[PDB]
Amino acid sequence: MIEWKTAKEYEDITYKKCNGVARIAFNRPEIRNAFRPKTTSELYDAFYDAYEDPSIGVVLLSGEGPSPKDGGWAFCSGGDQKAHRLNILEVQRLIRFMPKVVIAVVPGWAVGGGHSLHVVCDLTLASKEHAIFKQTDADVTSFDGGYGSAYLAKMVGQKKAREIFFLGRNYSAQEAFEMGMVNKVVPHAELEDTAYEWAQEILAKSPTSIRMLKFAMNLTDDGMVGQQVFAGEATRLAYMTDEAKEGRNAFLEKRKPDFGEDQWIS
Amino acid sequence: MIEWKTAKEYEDITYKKCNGVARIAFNRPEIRNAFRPKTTSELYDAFYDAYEDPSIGVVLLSGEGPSPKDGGWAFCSGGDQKAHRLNILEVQRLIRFMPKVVIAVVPGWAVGGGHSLHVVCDLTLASKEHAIFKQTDADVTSFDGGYGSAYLAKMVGQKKAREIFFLGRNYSAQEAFEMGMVNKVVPHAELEDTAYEWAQEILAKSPTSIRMLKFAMNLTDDGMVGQQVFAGEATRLAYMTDEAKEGRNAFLEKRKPDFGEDQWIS
Amino acid sequence: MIEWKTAKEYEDITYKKCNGVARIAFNRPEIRNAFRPKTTSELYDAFYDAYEDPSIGVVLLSGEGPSPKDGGWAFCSGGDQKARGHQGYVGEDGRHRLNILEVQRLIRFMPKVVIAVVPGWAVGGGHSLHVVCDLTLASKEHAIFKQTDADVTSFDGGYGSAYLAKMVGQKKAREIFFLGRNYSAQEAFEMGMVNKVVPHAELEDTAYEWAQEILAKSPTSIRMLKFAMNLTDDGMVGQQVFAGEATRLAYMTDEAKEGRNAFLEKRKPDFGEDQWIS
Amino acid sequence: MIEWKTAKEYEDITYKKCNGVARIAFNRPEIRNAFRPKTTSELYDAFYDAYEDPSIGVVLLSGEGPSPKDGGWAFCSGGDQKARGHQGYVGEDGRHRLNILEVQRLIRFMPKVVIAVVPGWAVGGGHSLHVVCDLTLASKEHAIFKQTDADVTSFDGGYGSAYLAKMVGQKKAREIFFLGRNYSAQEAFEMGMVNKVVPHAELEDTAYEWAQEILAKSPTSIRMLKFAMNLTDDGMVGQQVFAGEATRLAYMTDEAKEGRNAFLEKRKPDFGEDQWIS
Amino acid sequence: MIEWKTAKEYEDITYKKCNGVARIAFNRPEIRNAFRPKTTSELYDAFYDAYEDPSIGVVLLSGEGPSPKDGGWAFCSGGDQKAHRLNILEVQRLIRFMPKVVIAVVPGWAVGGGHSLHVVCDLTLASKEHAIFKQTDADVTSFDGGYGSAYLAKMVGQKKAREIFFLGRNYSAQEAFEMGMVNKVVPHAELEDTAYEWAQEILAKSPTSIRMLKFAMNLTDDGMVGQQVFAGEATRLAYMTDEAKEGRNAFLEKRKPDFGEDQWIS
Amino acid sequence: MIEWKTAKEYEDITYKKCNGVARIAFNRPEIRNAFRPKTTSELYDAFYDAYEDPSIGVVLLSGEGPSPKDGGWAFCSGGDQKARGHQGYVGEDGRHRLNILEVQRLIRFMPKVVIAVVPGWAVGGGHSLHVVCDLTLASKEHAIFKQTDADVTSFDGGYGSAYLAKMVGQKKAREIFFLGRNYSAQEAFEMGMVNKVVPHAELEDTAYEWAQEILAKSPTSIRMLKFAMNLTDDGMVGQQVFAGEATRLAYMTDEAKEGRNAFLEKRKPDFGEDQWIS
Which positions in this protein are listed as binding substrate (chains C, D, F) (predicted)? Predict the structure, then answer.
C-alpha cells in the first residue's frame, strides 16, 4: 500500500505526501465534493505548500468518497451555489505555473468549476465506471471563459468544447478519452494506485526537462505570461554557467568581464 | 412534428422558424446544393435576419433533398464553378460573430466551400449513412486559407487538416466524428429531429452564458476581433450595474460620480 | 474647391463623394457630434455603401461644425448618454444595442483606407472610432483627444484600448484610459496615434490630398497591405480576410482557369511540369 | 502634506497607505535599492496586502533615498549580486529562487493600477520592474534607465524585454538590452516607456495626484480596462483574468439570480422571452 | 515497382527521386537510425536539394531497415547520445517552410528527436505492426520545446502532448492514429508503396493551392514568420497580374502608373 | 582606422571582417544599390558565412557609395525592376524567385546582432531589409526612408509591414505604405524605426563602435535576449528558436551529463533529491 503521510489538516480537503507525490483531495463527499470559499482557500494553501516543497514533483488532485448518502462518487461538483476571498482562478493559475506536474484524478462527478479544474491540470486519469464529466455553467448564468473553455478547446478541439458548454450533457471516462481530455481510463478500483504509478514514472525523469517541457507546452497558449515563466527557467539555466560566474564576479570586482574568444556560436 | 413557419421566401434556399430555432437550408438538390452568387446573397440575408431576431437563439444550417435525379443527398457542394456581390467570407463572419449558436446539419455531400461552411459553424451533426466530407479546393486552384483550413486544425489537429486539403479524399460521418469535426453521428432518418432537439437543449440555457461562452471560445483564435466581440458583451454586462447608472447620471447632471467606498475588490 | 456630390441624405450625418473619395461626417455639432442609435445606423449604412462602391478607394470620417450654440468644434463625443440605458443604447425600436462595434468592424475589414479627420473633440466612443481608422489627421488648433470611458462605467476593451496600445504603446494607452486627460493634436502625433498635425483651415483639404495620394497607388497593393497590417493583430479573422484576398489573386491565374475547366469538363486537370517552384 | 500611515514594518522596504493609495518603496538606498531575496519576499508581502485591501485602488512603487553614502538617488538597481549564485539568488533558507517573477505577476494581475515612481537609477531587474508597472513617472533631474542584464550573463526574457517592446517598439527595446546605455527621463518619455517627466521635488506628490485621478474613476472600468490591455499580450492567462472579471459582472444580474435559484430549488430556470439580443 | 533514381550518395542516409516524389531515409539501421552530426548535415543537404528542385512536390522522410542485428525496424531513434554544425532545428525549419508536402513514413521506432521530426512533417503514415512512438527527451535532460512539444499539442491536444513527454511511454501506430498525430495506419508490407500513392494524389493537385494551403495552416501557429511566408507567396500571385505589369512598366518608363477605373472592388 | 580584411569577393556586395564585426554592404551604387537575383544570392552567402563564424557577433548591413553617376547615396533601393517578371525576380538560371525572404529569415534567426547602417535612400525592399535588422543607424544628412511597394503592385506583407508596426505603431506603418512618402533620418528616429541619427561622415565608424559595445556583453545574454524579443512576434518559430537555445544551456549541466551517461550505460539516471525547486 501507498504509505501516505498527512501533510496538513484541513476542514474541506485532505493533503498527504509520499515519495515525491502530494495528494490534495476534496473531502465533502456528502455533497459530491462541491467547493465553498473555505474549500478554495484550503486548496490554495495546500497547492502553495506543494509548490514550495522541493521534494514534491507531482501533485494529484482527487476526490474522497463515496458519499455516505447514496454510495456515489465525486471528483468535484464545482461551486457550492449556496455560497479578498481566494477564488478558484488563483488556484487555476497556481496549478498552471507551478514547476510540478498536476494530475487530475477523477473518481466520479466532475461538474462545472470541478470540470474546469480537471481541464487545467496537466493530465487527467478517470474512473472507467464512475467518472462523469458535465458542464453546468450555462445552467446558472456563469461561465469559465478561460482555462475551462478556451483551453478545453486545446485538448478536445473547438467543436467538442462548444458542445460540452452549450448543451451541458454528461460524458463518461471513455467518451472523454476519445475526445482528448482524459489521458487514461482506469478501472475504479485501480484509479488511485495508477495515479501514483504515473506520478512515480514522472518523478524518475529529469526535473529540468519536466519543468521546461511543462512551460514550453504552456507557452504556446499563455502569451507573455507563458513567455515570462519559460524564459525565467531559462535564466536559471544561464545562471549555472561559468559565463555567469564571470559576469557576476566582474560586476562585483568592478572590472570588465572577459567572456572569452570565438563565443558567437551557432 | 416540428411546426416550422416559413420566415421568408427565397429562390435557392429555405428559411423557417420554430420555437427559438431558425433553419436555413440549401434548396438546389438537383445540383447537390452548390451555391451561386444569388445563393450566397440569400444566405447572408437569412442569417442576418436570424442575427437580428431576439427570439432566435439557435440557427440550423442544413440541406434539402434528396436529388430528384439520383436520390442522393447533399449539404452543400460548394461554389457553383459555372459562376459588390456578397461572398461566402461575409457569411462565415456573420456565423462566427452572431450571438446565437449555429449548427451545421449535414445530410449528404459537404464539399469544398460547403465543407468550409460546416467547419465554421459552432457544432456539426451528420448523417450516419449519407454525410460525405470532402475538400476539393486543391483540385481547382482555390483555397480557404482561413476558417476552412487553419480553423479546421483547431478541431481535428494539424495533421488531419493537412490531409483533408492535400489529398481531397472522402470521409464518412463516423470518420469525421473520430477526427473531431463532427459532434454526433445521427441516423439519417433522425438527423433533422435530433438537430432541433439539440437546439432546444441550448435554448433552455442562460442566454448570457451561451453568448459569453461562444465568444470566449472564439476569442482564443480570433485575436483583436475576438477581443472586440468578447469585450463588447462584457461592456453590456457593466452597463446593467448600479455603478453604471451612477456613471451616466453624474455625466448628465454635470457632477462628479460617487462610486462608493472600498470598491477595489479582488 | 472639391466638387463633392451628396451621395445620400441622412438625419445625423453627411455623406458625399468626389473622384474616388467618400466623406462621412458627423452632423450633430450642437451636441458635439455624439452618436445616438440612429447615428450609428446611418454610419453603418454610409460605410457599407462606400464599401460596395468600386469607385471609392478612400473614406474620410470627419465631423461637421462648429457648434452654432457655443462655437466649439467636435469630431465625435461618443455615445449620446441620453440614449444610454440597461444593456446599451436604446433605439427607437426599443432595442439596447452596442452596434458601433459593427461599424468598427466594417471600417477594419473594408478593402479601402479609412482616414479619421479630427477637427475638434474626439471623446470616448468618438476617440475609439478615430483609433480604429487606418490613419488620423488632426486639427492643430482644435483637435483634443480624451477618453471618458472610465468616468461613466464604460469601456471599449477592444479596438479602443488594446488596439490603441498597438500605436502608442502600452504605457500611454493605459494613461489615456486610466486618467482621462486631454491631449492636443501635437501630443497625439508625438505618441503615435495621429499621422499629421494640420492647420484647422487646411484639415479637410489636406485629408482629400492624402486620399488622392493613396488613390494613385496599386489597389491590389493597398488592399493586401491593409490586410497584412490587420493580420498581425486580428488572429483568425485577419487570416480569413488576408487569405481571402489571396484566393482572389489565385483565381485570376491560368492555373485556376485550368482547374475550373477540368472540373466542369469531368477530366483530370493538367497543371504542367516543374511547377513546384521556390 | 500627504497623511501617510505606515501599514506594516519591513527590513528592506517601506509600506504606507493614504486615502486609497498604497506606497511601496525600496529602502536600501546605501546600496542603490538593490533587492536581495528578503527584499523580494517583502515586496510580495506588501503587494499582496494591497491586492487584498478593497480600499486601495492604486499602488505606487517607488524608492527611498538618497544614499547617505554618496548622495545618489535610486529607484532600484536590480538583484543584489552579492546574493546571486547557482540557479538564482540565494536566500537565508538556502533556496536559489527567481521570485521577482512572482512579484511581476502580482503587479500584472492585480485589479489595481500600479505606478512606478522613479526618483533615480532604474537598473537591471529594477528597470524590468518599472516596465511591468502600468504607468511610470520619472524624476527629470535624476531618473536614469539602464539595462545591465547582458553585462552579467542575465536576461529578463519576459516582461522586461518582450513587453518593453510593446511600449517603446522592437528597435528601441533591442537597443536598451544589447548596448546597456543610460537613458534620461526625457529620453525614456520620448521612446514611450515613461508617462511623465516630473521635477524631482514634485515627483512623489505628482504620483499621489495621478493616483487620486484614477481613484475618482469607475472601479469596474479601471479593472476591465487594465485587463483588456493585458489581454492582447497575455494570451490564455490574460483571457482567464479578463473573462473572470466578466463572470463577476454576470453574477450580479437578475438572470444569474434566477439561474442559481432554479438550481438550488431543483427546477428548470426561466430566463425569459426574446433574450437572444444583438 | 517504384522506379526510384538515386539523387545523391550519402554516408548515413539515402536520397532518391521518382515522378515528383523525393525520398530521404535514415540508413543506419544497425543502430536504429539514430542521427549523429554527419547525419543531420546530410539531411539538411538532401532536404535543401528537394526544396530547390521544381520537379519535386512531395518529400517522403523514412527509415531503411531492418536492423541486421535483431531484425527490428526503425524510423529514427533521435540524437546519437555518443556525440557551425548544421543541427536538427535548421532541418525542422526547412521541412516547415518548404513549398512541398513532407510526409513522415514511420516503419519502426520514432524516438526522441526522431519523434519530433515525425511531428513537424506535414503528414505521418505509420507501420501497423512495427511503428513505436516514444519521447525520451525527459530521460536525458533534453527537451524539444518547439515543434516537438508545443506543436505536438496542435495535433494531439494539450493533455496527450504532456503525457507523451512527461512519462516517455511507447505508443503504437493505432494509438498514435487515435490521438491525432498519425494520419493513417498502414500494414508494414504496404507502407512505402502507400506513402508513394499518397504523394501521387498530392502531386495531381494545383501546386498553387498546395503551397498556399500548407502556408495557411502554418500561419495560424507560426506568427510573424508564418505571415512572412504566406504573404510572400501572395506577393508572387500579385506579380503575375496585368496590374503588376503596369506597376513595373510605369516605374521603368518613369511615368505615373494607370491602374484603371473602378478598381476598388469588394 | 578600422583594420578590415576582405572575407570573400563578390560581384554586387562587399564582405569584410574586423575584431568580431562583419560588414556586408551593397556595392552597386550606380543603380542606387538595388538588388538583382545575383545580389540576393550573394547576400545570403555572406550572411550565412557570418552566421557560421564563431568570432563574429555583430553584422553591419550597409551600402557603399556614393553613385559615381550622380553623387547620390543609397542604402538599398529594393528589387531591381529590370529583373522583375512573372512570379518574381528572374535569375540567370531562369527561376522566378522571391528569396530576399530567405535572407530576411537568416537575419532574423541568426544568434548575432544585425545592424542596418543606412547612408542614403532605403526604398522598397531595401526599406524592408532595414526594418528586419535588429538595430538601424542612419545618416543625418542623407538617409531617406521610402516605401514604394504600393507604386509597383508589390507588397512586403511580413517583416516589411506588420513588423514595421511593432516599432513605429500601426498608424505610422500604414502611412508609410499607403502614401509612399519620404522620411528623413530624424523623422524615422522620432517614429521609432531608427535607433540613432548620426552625422554622415561618422556613420560607419559609429556603427563599428556600437558593434564593439555589443561584443563586450555576455554572448549568451545577447542570444537569449534577441530570441526573447523575436519570440513575442514569431509564434511557434520564435518558440522553436528560443527553446532551442535553452536546450543548449540545459546540455551543459551536470544533470544532463548524468542523463546522457545513464542512457549510454543502460541504467536508471539518478538526478538527486529535493530537485523540484521553485
Answer: 32, 77-81, 89, 121-125, 148, 154, 251, 266
Cβ-Cβ contacts under 8 Å, E112 against chain A? none
Please choose, from the candidates F95, C167, F244, D117, the residue with its C-alpha nearest in 3D space to the C-alpha of residue A266.
Answer: F244
Chain C residue with the nearest C-alpha to that of B79: C260
* Cβ within 8 Å, pair D218-C152: yes
Instruction: Write the CATH number for C192.
Output: 3.90.226.10
Q: In the numeric block, which cell numbers belong to residue C33? A: 457630434
Given a contact cutoff of 8 angstroms between Cβ atoms, the answer to whether E41 and E84 are in contact is no
In a domain, B260, yes or no: no
Say whether A220 and E150 touch across the interface (CB within 8 A): yes
Who contacts A150 (Cβ-Cβ below 8 Å, separation ≥6)?
A161, B216, B217, B219, B220, D236, D239
* CATH number where F255 lies: 1.10.12.10
Phi first, then psi: what are they for A70, rounded to 5°?
A: -130, 10
Identify whether residues E167 and E250 lie together within a single domain: no
**Joined grid coordinates for residue B200:** 432546444
Chains sharing 3 or more CB pairs under 8 A with chain F: A, C, D, E
- Residue bearing cell 549510454: F264
The reply to whether residue F263 touches residue E140, judged by beta carbons under 8 angstroms, is yes
Calculate the alpha carbon distances from C10 to A208, C25, C40, F143, F258 in Å: 66, 11, 11, 49, 78
- Please indicate, yes or no, whether residues F207 and F221 belong to a single structural domain of this protein: no
Q: With contact defined as beta carbons under 8 Å apart, do E133 and E170 qualify?
A: yes
CB atoms within 10 A of CB C86: 12
CA dist D220 and D141 (Å) reads: 36
Annotation-wise, does C79 bind a ligand? yes
Q: Is B136 helix (H, G, I), strand (E, B) or coil?
A: coil
DSSP state of E207: H
**Residue F216 in 3-state DSSP?**
coil
* CB-based contact C177:C150 (threshold 8 Å): yes
Instruction: Clarify whether residues B185 and B88 are in a common domain.
Output: yes
Give CA–CA dist C203/C140, Å, rounded.
Answer: 9
Q: State how many domains chain A has.
A: 2
Quote the CA–CA distance of C187 and C192 in Å, as a whole number.
Answer: 9
Q: How far apart are CA D66 and CA A86, in angstroms?
A: 38
**Checking DSSP bridges between strand A132-134 and strand A101-106, what pairing results, if any?**
unpaired
Using DSSP's 3-state secondary structure scheme, residue C234 falls into helix
3-state secondary structure B222-259: HHHHHHHHHHHHHHHHHHCCHHHHHHHHHHHCCCCCCC
Alpha carbons B210 and A135: distance in angstroms, whole number: 12
Find out whether the peptide bond into C66 is cis, omega within 30 degrees of 0.
Answer: yes
Specify whether E17 is located in the same domain as E148: yes
Assess whether B38 and B167 both reside in one domain: yes
Range of the domain at F226: 216-266
Whether residue E131 is found in the same domain as residue E171: yes
User: Do the bridges between strand A21-26 and strand A58-63 make them parallel or antiparallel, or are there none, so unpaired?
Assistant: parallel
Q: Which residues have a C–N gap over 2.5 Å right after them in chain C?
A: none
Name subunits touching D (3+ CB pairs < 8 A). Answer: A, B, C, F
Q: Is C179 on the interface with F (CB under 8 A)?
A: no
Query: F52: which residues sit within 8 A by CB, 6+ positions away?
Result: A266, E84
Resolution of this entry, Å: 1.6
How determined?
X-ray
Peptide bond before residue B66 is cis, with ω within 30 degrees of 0: yes
The residue to which cell 539555466 is assigned: A237
Residues 6+ apart with CB under 8 A from C246: B143, B145, C224, E212, E230, E233, E234, E237
CB-nearest partner of D263 from A139, A240, A241: A139
* Residues E16 and E22 sit within 8 Å (Cβ to Cβ): yes
CB contacts, 8 Å: E180 with chain B: 156-157, 159-160, 179-180
